[PDB]
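Example record

One chain of 317 residues, shown exactly as stored in the release files.
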Amino acid sequence: TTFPTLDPELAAALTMLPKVDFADLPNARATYDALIGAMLADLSFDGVSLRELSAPGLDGDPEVKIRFVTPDNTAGPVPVLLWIHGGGFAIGTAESSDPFCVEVARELGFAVANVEYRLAPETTFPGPVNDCYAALLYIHAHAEELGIDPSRIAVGGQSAGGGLAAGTVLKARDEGVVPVAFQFLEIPELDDRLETVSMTNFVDTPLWHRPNAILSWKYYLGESYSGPEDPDVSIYAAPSRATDLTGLPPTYLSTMELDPLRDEGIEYALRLLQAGVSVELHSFPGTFHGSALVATAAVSERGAAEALTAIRRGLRS
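Predicted structure tokens for this chain:
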């Protein structure tokens, strides 16, 4: 009865749901890392293999490791998904996305380059998006050696990883080096200004909420950033601030009903469409930020199936 529009199937999973409070980052990191590692313990890697790649960082930055998932038995060159995990820019690891990356490699027969970007606040913007772009530059430049079709690279991510994906895709277009065939944005974190209705009204929704949103952008943009009215925010940090969305790749964007990020996701999708970009936009009913973690729910199963359908079609021949 606190959230009467929730899907009953999800509703269930809510009394157990841990607080991931950004105000205490060490503890946030620990409860998240445990809410994921519990799931990685029994994960099947049947039909795929994982090896680590090392992409040179931008400027004098350290190497960016990539968890590179490939399907077994596969003639190749195959399409590749560059994937970027979520966690509000300040928590999470690439391995936390191994379930999804294995799924894509096994079901679609695509390589997946899952990027270990550096976390904020220890590394503030531009570092994290630079690590993702460095990984993109590397996979594109080494595609032949890696058994990748350079004409069929997707860039995607979830939550903050969807903001990093969108920023990386803006950067790729603007620099003109790497062609991106498809963009996949799941519950993306795109706008630091926190001025949409969902961002003003969702103050204690499950997992993500306005208090976490404030802390997440502050960690990422750093101790100089002065907040929503700051005029000096890069479009690669907050893609919603970009004014020219033309010439971006065909895109899939999903949002959740009770997610504070919902409205900035729908608005970005609408502006992509209005810029002539092919977009699939899906706001799922009765859901919350991260309810896909309740993988058994029918609405989660529908979302997961559609994600594979979208990526499969987005990277067709």
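Notes: DSSP finds ten helices and eight strands in the chain.
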